[PDB]
Scaffold this active site. Structure first.
Site, PDB file in Angstrom:
ATOM      1  N   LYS A 229       0.795  -1.194   0.001  1.00 29.79           N
ATOM      2  CA  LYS A 229       0.206   0.066   0.049  1.00 29.79           C
ATOM      3  C   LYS A 229       0.809   1.250  -0.087  1.00 29.79           C
ATOM      4  O   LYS A 229       1.999   1.212  -0.056  1.00 29.79           O
ATOM      5  CB  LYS A 229      -0.996  -0.101   1.298  1.00 29.79           C
TER       6      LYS A 229
ATOM      7  N   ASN B  25      -1.993  -0.258   7.223  1.00 26.63           N
ATOM      8  CA  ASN B  25      -1.564  -1.468   7.756  1.00 26.63           C
ATOM      9  C   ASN B  25      -0.666  -2.159   6.537  1.00 26.63           C
ATOM     10  O   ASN B  25      -0.352  -3.255   6.354  1.00 26.63           O
ATOM     11  CB  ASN B  25      -2.699  -2.543   7.867  1.00 26.63           C
TER      12      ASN B  25
ATOM     13  N   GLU C 169      -9.176 -10.223  -7.317  1.00 26.93           N
ATOM     14  CA  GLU C 169      -8.263  -9.276  -7.206  1.00 26.93           C
ATOM     15  C   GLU C 169      -7.095  -9.397  -8.441  1.00 26.93           C
ATOM     16  O   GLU C 169      -6.709  -8.297  -8.829  1.00 26.93           O
ATOM     17  CB  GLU C 169      -7.716  -9.562  -5.868  1.00 26.93           C
TER      18      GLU C 169
END
Lengths: 139, 138, 139, 138, 138, 139
Positions: C11, C114, C128
């Site tokens: 991320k 996270n 995904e």
């Protein structure tokens, strides 16, 4: 609260074995902020005050003697949920119960030689911080 | 022998979470930590640290940057700790530094070179006296 | 099956904090095979599509905004039991629950930060993977 | 400044599980990843990469080896990233490389030297254009 | 090619918990471990190891120190393993050694330099024959 | 007792994948003392003797063949509670059950390729040590 703080100490065995940087590094990697730091050899009085709740226990003299045997490193860390995460990082206080991945899990064997201490609660953290640091030592 | 050197992690080194890494390298080298503290340098402290360059350009920018956030001050003790300290940090200018050294591994720009180490025993004694009281050394 | 595949993403916080190599390295060390890889900054539409099951939740705009705030790294890993092992490697999705030794256990504090995402099941992994990669991007 | 370099992990580097290690060293250095992909080079791609040595011996063996399995292509951005890239990888010939560098730590043989980095800005621009479309750079 | 070198972790290297680190660096380099044992050298073994310096001062102190505790003996195999071994260990005198090497990372004093590696193929063959039987090599 | 001992082996996959130093290093870091060490390729007879309790199981020939396929590293470690701590360090024998932070948790995927073996009890440790080492090989 983001401003939660904890007290962490590297004990004399941890300092002698060169684990200071490693511990600090794990806290930095976790994302917490170091706000206070010093190295000192506890006096007998300091070691006894630190272990004051256990002063009637028979292994107390050994704990005090060992804790005052050489330099420790005192730290204060700041961040969200820092107390619980600190304890989790150090691992179970008895190394026999500690998980690999943790400080005690990776580095310690004997409970009287468990390398490092972390506050077990916010109240305890406030007490330990106040014990080891004046307010003006905290950046 | 009982030689001592001064090492500081500069604000960039502290911000990037490199304090523990640097301490760990000295520990692994076999050196003994005898003094340690964290603080944001005052203007006066920053000017004192860079006192030798006060007639050089952008002295105020260097001073401002060094007082811009916390540093970690340390004193390390051991045979050849000064020289070894210099070797461990790597060339002051990261562009000339070799991987395996602190600046070699983590720095690109001399203006952001993570850490400082005394360049001599004389300099060590000056810096140690500047940053620490006699009673702060264990 | 040896050909099981999972989707892993670093991320924006994980990329900014320089954790890409570390995560990849843990998957390599575990013995899994990287079969697809790219870096990109998600569009708003991509972030919303990614979090589409939670689109009615009040913290959704913050998730979408954050996820689209900077580059992420998309990966596909291949190997036996790779989905479950992937999640185990990343650790509990809430870092407060994550164990040291895991990616989130070692590096993350806040749940909205996270660091990294892993598919929670084979169905989810397929979704995904198909979302982020065309079939022809997978080596 | 906004300088960019191209780095590839060769089939040997990918097979030995060294991709993450190499990325991590650039991240730790403070550099910014701007492009990334994994692929097995075609014959044509491998010939293009080694185009300058096509009149040298065993050009086909080098080409065959490079197209023998996946590589990881990357583009990294930052001040002096080209030079720093070369320094990080270590001497192209592992036998001349210093520990602390990638080749220094992981390679023995020039024929199996784990990774490749552009030797110049000009070379970087050529390689980047070769491996990536304009629209692949973030 | 099928070249072999001898590496020993000296008593100081074993005591400081550095055996695994040193093995790991050779493994990471791509070398193959072909012999391994732990032992406290006898007086005679220590004298044999330092046989070339027997007419130099403090030969007995060196001998005494080397037989003072366990060492780890190893034989490693691979192309250029001798040279690579020397490079990995770093300068014999830690004061001249570069970080990234074993002595560079962990040693300060030539008298406590953690490990020993053969300085030549000839020396390797001598040391290997000294510490291992033919039947101990896999 | 401080003199407790355990047998640890790096299996052929662990040796081939260059994990010997890493495992040894984790035991050194934990604080245990290496007292015996060798490298060898097990004979068929040695592999069968090692797995002798499972000799009637159908996957036995594969275990024996694999175990005898290349060099293993044999070790003996000494210290307080060293057996239990050894197993904890290696992690669950089935890597699917192993926690990150452990040897198998970090490095292994398949149970027939679980990198390394540790004695499961003091009795077993004594048997394995005696199997692999003569008394005079232990320093």
């Amino acid at each position: 609260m983001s401003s939660e703080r904890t007290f962490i100490a590297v004990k004399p065995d941890g300092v002698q074995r060169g684990l200071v940087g490693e511990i600090i590094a794990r806290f930095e990697r976790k994302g917490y902020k170091l706000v206070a730091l010093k190295i000192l050899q506890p006096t007998t009085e300091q070691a006894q005050g630190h272990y004051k709740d256990l002063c009637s226990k028979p292994f107390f003299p050994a704990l005090v003697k060992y804790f005052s045997s050489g330099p420790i490193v005192c730290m204060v860390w700041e961040g969200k949920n820092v107390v619980k995460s600190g304890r989790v990082l150090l691992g179970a206080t008895n190394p026999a119960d500690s998980q690999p991945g943790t400080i005690r899990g990776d580095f310690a064997v004997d409970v009287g030689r468990n390398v490092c201490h972390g506050s077990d609660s916010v109240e305890s953290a406030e007490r330990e911080i106040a014990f080891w640091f004046k307010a003006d030592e905290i950046a």
